[model samples]
Each structure stands twice: as C-alpha cells, then as structure tokens.
Target: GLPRRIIKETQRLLAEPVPGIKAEPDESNARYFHVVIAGPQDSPFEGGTFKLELFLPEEYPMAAPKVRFMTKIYHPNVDKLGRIKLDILKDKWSPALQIRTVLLSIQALLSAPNPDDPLANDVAEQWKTNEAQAIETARAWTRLYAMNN
Candidate 1:
C-alpha cells in the first residue's frame, strides 16, 4: 500500500542526506537503504560510523522493515559481518513504525547494546564482563569500514 510513498522518501534521502546520516539504496526502488550512523557520544561507538542495510517490506507499515549491520563489527548484538540480533528485526517490531523511528531505535541500540542477548558469544561475554574492550572493538571496526569513506 505505502510502497510507493516509502520508496519516494527513501529516494529523497538518497538525493540529499539528513545531517549525519547517509541513506543510499542499492537500486532505484529504494527498497534497500544502506546508511551510516555517526557514532553517538559517550558510547563505545562514538566518533565513528556504522553501515546498515534497511529493506522496506511490501506490507510496509503493516510489517517491520528488515534491518542489518553491513559493516564488519564486533558487537555483542551484531555478528562478525555486522548482522544484528534477530529480535529487534522481527519479534520486537510493530506496525506503527516509521523509518526515522527505526533509525532512532538503532541509534539508541548503539548506546545500550543488549549484551545479554547476543549473536557473538565472546563479544557478548566481553560486553557483559568488560565494556571498555567491547566498545573499543565496535569503534575500531566502524573506523576501519564506515569512517574511511
């Protein structure tokens, strides 16, 4: 239903980014958005940026858009290739969501990562036990991949 409109907004962002974020789709449909989240303050992820892949579903507002980290990150909640934990992408989703809101949620996640429920076991334990190193790893990877561009 809202595919066209969502696609339009996605395209507009690609044309001109909003502040710190850069949104780019793989193709014209804009169904897939590749974005960079500028590392937020006071977090392990500060001073760097991470890449994300967002896919708008056909159901759109009725369904949760698929989101994943595309950079090589070492977060408790993200896999080695930057794939995020599954819960936020699916079970925790709702119908009344917007792209901005979802982006905000992801931004928040950068600060308060769920190390308890993690995709990378060692990273999780590292986060759970030693936060400094975990955050450093995330920041290091961000710098390596997202910041160089």
Candidate 2:
C-alpha cells in the first residue's frame, strides 16, 4: 500500500512543477516517477533536457528513493548506465527530505558538478586537468543524447 505521505508529495510535485523540471508518476504505479530536467545555463549540460526515473521503495522515508538518469549525461558524477552518485540521493539522504527537494538537488548537480568526487573517474580526470575540453565533451554528449529527444 502506498503511504499517505508519498501520495501527498506526488500530488504537490504535479501541482507545483519545478522550473526546468517536470516529474510525473507512473499511471500504474504511483511509486514510480518519470522526470525531465532542463539543463541550466552556463553549465556543460546547457541547452539539453535530461530524462530520469525515480522509484520509491517499500521502505521509503526510511530509505532513500532510487533515482537514475535515463538519458546519457557526460558528467563525472553520472556513470555510463546513467546512475548518479550524488550525496543527497545516497548517504546524505534524510527522511525529512521530500521528492521535490531530491529532484531539485539533481538539477543543481547538473549546474555544479563535483569532479573531485566522481563515479566516472575518467571524466573527473578530464575535468581536473582540462576543464574546457571536458565541458566541450559534456556539451557534445548532451546535444547528441539529451537534445534529440
């Protein structure tokens, strides 16, 4: 059974959509959400719209929801499989936090990538030594994968 808090939170997300971000629950399963975040300006991912999926486990509120990129993003924090390694979505998650906050946090990640702590080390290294080249690559990839859809 879906919890009342989850239901309410989902409703709020739909009622008040975040700027540059849209999140909608699956018709069959309210626990599953389909999301899209428009890349912020001046970021490598700019001019792109990235898709993602977020699933709330049965123990949600106690455990963090599972969120992963559906669109490939060339970023240090996002793996090839589109899995993101952001602190707020992982260890730093708190039960007090809601879906809107999590999604917004992800949008922030697209704005400011933390190359120091990365899931994709090669990209991180590129970001460390040659930031311009890395940003160019990220921009190219975003155009290829994210903009097409």
Candidate 3:
C-alpha cells in the first residue's frame, strides 16, 4: 500500500535508535522488514542478537503489522515459530500505532516474557516455576538451534 511511506518510516528508525534495537527494510520487499534486538541484560538472552520479521499489513496504522521471531527462541509468550502474544496484536490495536512504537513493545518482551497468558505452555511453565532450569534450557536452545554446531 505505502511503499514509500514504509521506506521513509523505516529510514527514520535507522537514522536514530533508542539503545538495543534497530530496523530496516527487507532486501526483497519494502513491505517486509528485518529487525534486530540486543538481548536484554542479565537474561539468558543477553549478548545475543535476535531477528524478527515485520510485515506491514495493507491496513497498517489501522491494523497491527505482523511481527514474528525469525530467530529461534524458547519463550512462554512466543510460539515455536516465534509468534508473540502481545496485547496490541490481539485486542489493543489502534490506528494511531506506528511501526516505531510497536517495535519498542517487542523489545520489552525478551527478558520480560508474559507467562500468565502464554503461547508456549511448556516454556511458560518452566520459566514461571523454575527460573534456573528455564535459563539453562533457553541458553541451551540458543546454542543448539540459533547458533548450530
């Protein structure tokens, strides 16, 4: 719908960043995006660079852009494919929502996983019930799946 608009908005993100996140257009499609987030401090995800998919919907601003993890992760509120369970994506979307703001919401999800309402029940259970074990498992998955042998 808005190729130039998407390109321009994405450029604004590249021009200046908050701290731990960045965004850019996908090499292929202007409507598609690649996102990177620095793992939150002190979490098992610390020191890792994670990737996400951002596809601008035809009704963006009026509808939430679809965001999913391209990187492998073990988390409660994320599916095996890294789909996030966020309020905005579900019941809280508004026409005023912008790409920049939506991205910020995702960055907060890394270390602060929402377990009480989760997509991956096992991951949530482990995280809510056993912190250390969950940390190890997350670390292990990162090493095994994300990095590879």
The TM-score that candidate 2 achieves is: 0.96
For TM-score, the strongest prediction is 2
Q: Pick by lDDT: which candidate is best?
A: 2
Listed in order, each prediction's TM-score against the native is 0.81, 0.96, 0.86
lDDT of 2 by residue, 43-103 (tens): 9888899999999999899888899999998998999999989887778889999888888
Lowest summed-lDDT stretch of 10 residues in model 3?
140-149
**Residue 116 local lDDT, model 2:** 94
Can you write out model 3's per-residue Cα lDDT over 1-149, one digit (the tens) per residue?
55576666777877876677777887778878888776778777776778888888887767789999988888888889888999888679976776777877776777787778869998888888997898888877766655531
Instruction: Tell me which of candidates 2 and 3 scores higher on TM-score.
Output: 2
User: Clashes in candidate 2: how many?
Assistant: 0
The Cα error of candidate 1 at residue 69, in Å, is 1.2
Q: Rate the local accuracy (lDDT) of all candidates.
A: 0.74, 0.90, 0.79
> What is candidate 1's lDDT per residue for 118-137, written digit by digit as tens?
78899999989998887777
